[PDB]
């Protein structure tokens, strides 16, 4: 059995290994620095350390059963997976992350959990889990701000532990900058110790200050360096939030730039005000109903296989409905779908006029069209969704008395979405289908003569 890295099981295990890494990256340093935290809950820390070590062994077992993708196929051979795991640097980090440094507990004592700082080397699993999460998640921005908050909180927690350790090394309460005397009942509480250390670290790492000034030279040096780190952290927070803000309304900014450009164009070109209102209403409708970006530009980032398959899933069923293409080969209709060009219209727009040359065949997708009588007040018939016209004009039938000319004016009732198949595209698709072209000409001749 092998685990697909792109599957849901690998992501579910990535969460299950992220918890011991987060426990080690946050609480090992807290127990190393805050001695009361390590001493009071020692049995719970032993249980959690043993559980995290077990999960680390299982994680090393998972990487021996995680397939890598060569020649487009997932590798299921056990020896290839073992050698791929052992060849990378990750195996060395995983082995170093599980070196039995806990044997020093019987040498140094039960108050030295910094021997488990090698367990921090499994950070790659945490980073891989977060990089997979920022792909899978429905909300990239919410997870991005949550991840930034988590990283800032972890750094603040580490700096709080560092500040408490520096206060311990200097001595609690010897000066006003260090943490005060822990023999005081208020200051001696472990919750008070950690919360005030986190408060100091949050203050210093976010360019707030609001802390007692340093007294000794080492305290001044540490405060200067940690304020510089805090400037970096605050600038990172502001830059991440600003990049998030820019990415969140990037499409809105692009659409607003486009509509401002078209407003400037119709103001400069002395375009009539009714046309200006029509263009502004059209753009507002396109943004409101989520059709702002061109279909050609959207789908060109897809491969040719998926673009054709998506187009087949959209247009093929309607193309079969067209009378001329009803008997066509299933292979031929694939190219005709791929040559369909989207066309959008406004209320009152004329798709075609009577006496115009018909070079396209329009397929109505999400609109209603009217066959007006050169006045715009009466309609022969209203063409609903799935209808079509110009299917005979694209074909070339000799003897057509009204051939190559539109027989009536087609008027869009309102905001119609069409798909045209031009005569040139049909001919270049039929160049590879001679028999189909002849039978289309025969069927069009039959339609014209009936």
């Amino acid at each position: 059995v092998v685990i697909d890295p792109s599957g849901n099981t690998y992501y579910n295990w990535l969460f299950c290994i992220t918890l011991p890494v987060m426990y080690n990256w946050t609480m090992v340093i807290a127990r190393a620095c805050f001695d009361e935290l390590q001493s009071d809950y020692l049995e719970y820390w032993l249980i959690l350390d043993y559980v995290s070590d077990i999960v680390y062994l299982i994680d090393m077992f998972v990487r021996t059963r995680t397939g890598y993708l060569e020649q487009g196929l997932l590798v299921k051979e056990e020896l290839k997976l073992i050698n791929k795991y052992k060849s990378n640097l990750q195996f060395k980090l995983d082995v170093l992350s599980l070196i039995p440094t806990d044997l020093l507990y019987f040498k140094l004592g039960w108050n030295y959990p910094e021997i488990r700082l090698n367990r921090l080397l499994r950070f790659s699993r945490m980073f891989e889990f977060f990089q997979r999460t920022e792909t899978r998640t429905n909300y990239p921005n919410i997870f991005r701000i949550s991840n930034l908050v988590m990283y800032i909180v972890i750094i603040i927690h580490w700096n709080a532990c560092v500040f408490y350790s520096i206060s311990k090394a200097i001595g609690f309460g010897n000066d006003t900058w260090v943490y005060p005397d822990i023999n005081d009942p208020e200051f001696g509480r472990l919750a008070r110790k950690y919360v005030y250390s986190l408060y100091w670290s949050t203050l210093t790492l976010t360019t707030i200050g609001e802390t007692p000034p340093p007294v000794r030279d080492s305290e001044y040096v540490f405060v200067v360096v940690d304020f510089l780190i805090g400037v970096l952290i605050f600038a990172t927070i502001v830059g991440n939030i600003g990049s998030m803000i820019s990415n969140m309304n990037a499409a809105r900014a692009e659409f607003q730039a486009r509509i401002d450009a078209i407003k400037q164009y119709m103001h400069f070109r002395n375009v009539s005000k009714d046309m200006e209102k029509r263009v502004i209403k059209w753009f507002d409708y396109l943004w409101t109903n989520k059709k702002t970006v061109d279909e050609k530009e959207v789908l060109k980032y897809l491969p040719d296989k998926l673009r054709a398959e998506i187009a087949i899933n959209v247009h093929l069923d309607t193309l079969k409905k067209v009378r001329i293409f009803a008997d066509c080969e299933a292979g031929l209709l694939v190219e005709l779908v791929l040559k369909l060009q989207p066309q959008v219209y406004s209320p009152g727009d004329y798709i075609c006029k009577k006496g115009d040359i018909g070079r396209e065949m329009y397929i109505i997708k999400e609109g209603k069209l009217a066959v007006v009588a050169d006045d715009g007040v009466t309609q022969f018939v209203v063409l609903s969704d799935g209808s079509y016209f110009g299917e005979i004009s694209i074909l070339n039938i000799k003897g057509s008395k009204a051939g190559n000319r539109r027989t009536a004016n087609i008027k869009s009732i309102g905001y119609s979405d069409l798909f045209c198949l031009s005569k040139d595209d049909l001919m270049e698709a039929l160049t590879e289908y001679p028999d189909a072209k002849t039978m289309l000409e025969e069927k069009g001749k039959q339609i014209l003569m009936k």
Binding site: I208, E210, Q264, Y265, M275, D349, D356, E366
Partner: protein
């Protein structure tokens, strides 16, 4: 008004303003009445009167104004009373309006009324279209978001002060002053991470101050990040124009182009940017719908192209192809539009400016000045293989924008129209 259009109507956006200020009353004043003791028996009836006014605004909204909103389904404009009422009930807006009026004298029982925020977002969408230069409202809306975050912070600080006890410690609010602007001042120092406040002593005060400062760090980053995006978006066009203009100056400096040519390029960039706000109008037109692009080209050039004697009787669609192939070219003052004896292969339409035709002895005599809306050089489109030569010097009399269609693009759109191709070729041989 039996049925109103939400996207266009101004009475509807005025009603949206009223609904926003009714919803702003609930959002801003419910935490005030929850935290501050401003909701006393001596003035409770004013609070209840304004709450009834806001609820009446909500009720008038959901009953009258939301049920008569015309909508678009399948592209059609729906106007009848039956469909508009039924369509709104099926939307998320009616679902949120029902839960924004449920009864649930505690001010926290009116917290459902704060859930009518879809009217604010709908009102925001109108202000991004009704008024030009919409980044000004975005700064105001972001500032109002900051003012509300300090407002909630002010209510949270007074609750924390009162819960511990007023004047109990130095960190809590002591009790003197307006009791709102005092706690709002603490929010301003805190949420902007300004500091200067009394230090928190008790564990509850340190935890509250820690989170508040942490929240402020991200709140102050949102204000900067929003302004960074506003400044970048407001100056994006100027930056692109400056980078494009500096790229050509850098290009012209590398090849040692003399300043006589370089100042003409700088003049064109400055004139084109200050006139049309662009550097290429065709880059915008390719992003438009093909019907939008064609209708704009008809609204600009069809009243002129359909008046020249060369393309009379031609196909109307072929003329429509001529308008789409026309390109706007700006000629500098005293620039030679046509040289006497060069290859004539372009048709010029004067959209703006004056063009002088030279002649007489040794040139430099204005035989005629062609104003905007006139077309010259149309005969050149009918020649084959350099058969046309310009018979007179033609210069631009100061910053003329010419719509130019060349012989190559006309011949490319003349193979799709065999009927007009025969007629236009017949008119060529009929005059020579």
């Amino acid at each position: 008004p039996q049925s109103i259009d939400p996207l266009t109507n101004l009475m509807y956006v005025l009603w949206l303003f009223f609904v926003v200020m009714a919803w702003n009353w609930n959002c801003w004043l419910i935490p005030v009445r929850w935290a501050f003791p401003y909701q006393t028996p001596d003035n409770i009836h004013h609070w209840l009167l304004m709450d009834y006014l806001c609820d009446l605004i909500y009720f008038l909204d959901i009953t009258v104004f939301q049920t008569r909103l015309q909508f678009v389904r399948g592209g059609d404009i729906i106007t009848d009373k039956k469909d508009m009422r039924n369509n709104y009930l099926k939307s998320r807006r009616f679902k949120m309006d029902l839960l924004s009026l449920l009864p649930l004298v505690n001010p926290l029982l009116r917290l459902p009324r704060c859930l009518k925020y879809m009217a604010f977002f709908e009102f925001n969408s109108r202000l991004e279209s009704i008024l030009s230069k919409a980044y000004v409202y975005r700064v105001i809306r972001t500032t109002a978001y900051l003012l509300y975050s300090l407002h909630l912070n002010s209510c949270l600080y007074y609750w924390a002060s009162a819960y511990q006890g007023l004047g109990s410690t130095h960190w809590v609010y002591d009790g003197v002053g307006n009791s709102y602007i005092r706690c709002y001042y603490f929010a301003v120092k805190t949420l902007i991470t300004i500091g200067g406040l009394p230090d928190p002593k008790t564990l509850f005060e340190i935890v509250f101050q820690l989170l508040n400062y942490f929240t402020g760090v991200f709140a102050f980053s949102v204000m900067i990040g929003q302004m960074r995006d506003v400044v970048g978006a407001a100056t994006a066009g100027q930056t692109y124009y400056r980078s494009c203009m500096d790229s050509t100056v850098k290009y012209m400096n590398f090849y040692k182009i003399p300043k006589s040519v370089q100042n003409r390029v700088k003049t064109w960039y400055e004139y084109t940017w200050h006139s049309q706000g662009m550097l290429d109008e065709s880059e915008l037109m390719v992003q438009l719908p093909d019907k939008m692009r064609l209708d704009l080209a008809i609204d600009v050039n069809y009243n002129i192209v359909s008046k020249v004697a060369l393309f009379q009787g031609c196909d109307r669609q072929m003329i429509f192809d001529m308008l789409k192939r026309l390109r706007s070219v700006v000629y500098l003052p005293n620039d030679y539009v046509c040289k006497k004896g060069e290859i004539g292969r372009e048709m010029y339409i004067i959209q703006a400016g004056q063009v002088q035709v030279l002649g007489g002895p040794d040139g430099k005599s204005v035989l005629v000045t062609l104003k905007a809306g006139s077309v010259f050089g149309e005969i050149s489109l009918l020649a084959v293989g350099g058969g046309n030569r310009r018979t007179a010097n033609v210069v631009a009399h100061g910053f003329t924008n010419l719509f130019i269609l060349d012989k190559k693009d006309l011949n490319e759109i003349l193979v799709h129209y065999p009927e007009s191709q025969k007629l236009l070729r017949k008119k060529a041989r009929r005059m020579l």
